[PDB]
Design a protein around this ligand. Sequence first.
Ligand SMILES: CN(C)CCCN(CC[C@H](N)C(=O)O)C[C@H]1O[C@@H](n2cnc3c(N)ncnc32)[C@H](O)[C@@H]1O
Ligand SMILES: [Mg+2]
Ligand SMILES: [Mg+2]
Ligand SMILES: [Zn+2]
Ligand SMILES: [Zn+2]
Ligand SMILES: [Zn+2]
Length: 426
Amino acid sequence: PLKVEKFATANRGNGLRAVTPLRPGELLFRSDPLAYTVCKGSRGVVCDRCLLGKEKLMRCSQCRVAKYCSAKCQKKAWPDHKRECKCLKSCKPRYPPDSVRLLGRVVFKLMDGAPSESEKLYSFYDLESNINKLTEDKKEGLRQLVMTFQHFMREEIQDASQLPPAFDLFEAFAKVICNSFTICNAEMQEVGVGLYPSISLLNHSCDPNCSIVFNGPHLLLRAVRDIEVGEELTICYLDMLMTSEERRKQLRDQYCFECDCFRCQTQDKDADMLTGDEQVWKEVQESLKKIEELKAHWKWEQVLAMCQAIISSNSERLPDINIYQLKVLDCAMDACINLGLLEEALFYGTRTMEPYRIFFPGSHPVRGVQVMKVGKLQLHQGMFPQAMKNLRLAFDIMRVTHGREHSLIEDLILLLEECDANIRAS
Ligand SMILES: CN(C)CCCN(CC[C@H](N)C(=O)O)C[C@H]1O[C@@H](n2cnc3c(N)ncnc32)[C@H](O)[C@@H]1O
Ligand SMILES: [Mg+2]
Ligand SMILES: [Mg+2]
Ligand SMILES: [Zn+2]
Ligand SMILES: [Zn+2]
Ligand SMILES: [Zn+2]
């Protein structure tokens, strides 16, 4: 009962295509990960199982590394965590890279696990390594991860016979880097990384016809536009606010390919993204490196301090459509929400609305969540008609990008019903 199938593309390798016409919002695939792990920055912040930020987490007794929101989450996570727990324990104080911890879970899943439904269309052994396209610097980085893995796993795995029969650690890491999915929360922090081999069949487009959304570790693949029978299915591997030059570099470095898509050919939106004095937004772009690092580690007061020094800077300022200014406004909004400043969060969030409409496609999950947060801030500050307009716009987007299978849609429906009741009382 699949609406999608694997096929061999001409120049792109393997891909995924529709066997039947698809309509916007239609659910193509849903899977749990083959393996996944919390990211280094969100470790000890978000529950290891459900990846939700909780006010109270508790450490696993043995390793004291994994943290859980509930006994339910540690029990559900115990099969995945059982063997790595002894590895994390023995390697303290040192914490392995995310890719190393992710591959360790892959190895344990393949060794001790039943066949994973995540592999239905495509398996881990099928994944693209792009090894013959790797530069010598990339290969050396992989060699370092191999030795890190051999150190990190030395407790559980001392020899190749404990690895799967065909398993080559160099090839395995090459596969992990190109096939890893980043799991993000509503604040654009990356809370986790996981492998979904069936979903790895989707080739990239900067103008994709599909989108992925995450509910905890659970992934949902949906069509965001009408798709003809036989048409290849694509997602965007990258953040939507990047210049064609930035996208080219990232797609080269990580995925070893050159994007020929129409947006990259025409440098679509590049000029509008870079508006303002070039010297000014180079300095903002440099500051974003530190700001987004603080955000990855969930230090909001420090994020807001740096963001205000930009938005409010005595020195020259940039238009809100400048993508680096826009990223700063977004980080400030998310800091104000966590720090409990709603008026200021709404001020920043309101300023991101029109730029988000321009830069994000018609239905994109990032924009849907952004509009939902703004409408939610407006509702709680008691602007009902403004909140209702944005909550309805968020629903128009998120019914396509998220769908009834996503828990956030249920929350949005409750916000709409509350906002509507307030308007009718007036
Ligand atoms: C988490 N997710 C993002 C993983 C993607 C794994 N693959 C896709 C499936 C591949 N075709 C396969 O056979 O397994 C990427 C790889 O696919 C190629 N690829 C893609 N999109 C191109 C595109 N638009 N143009 C050219 N090559 C593309 C590229 O080599 C690139 O590393
Ligand atoms: Mg190849
Ligand atoms: Mg946001
Ligand atoms: Zn949990
Ligand atoms: Zn443990
Ligand atoms: Zn492109």
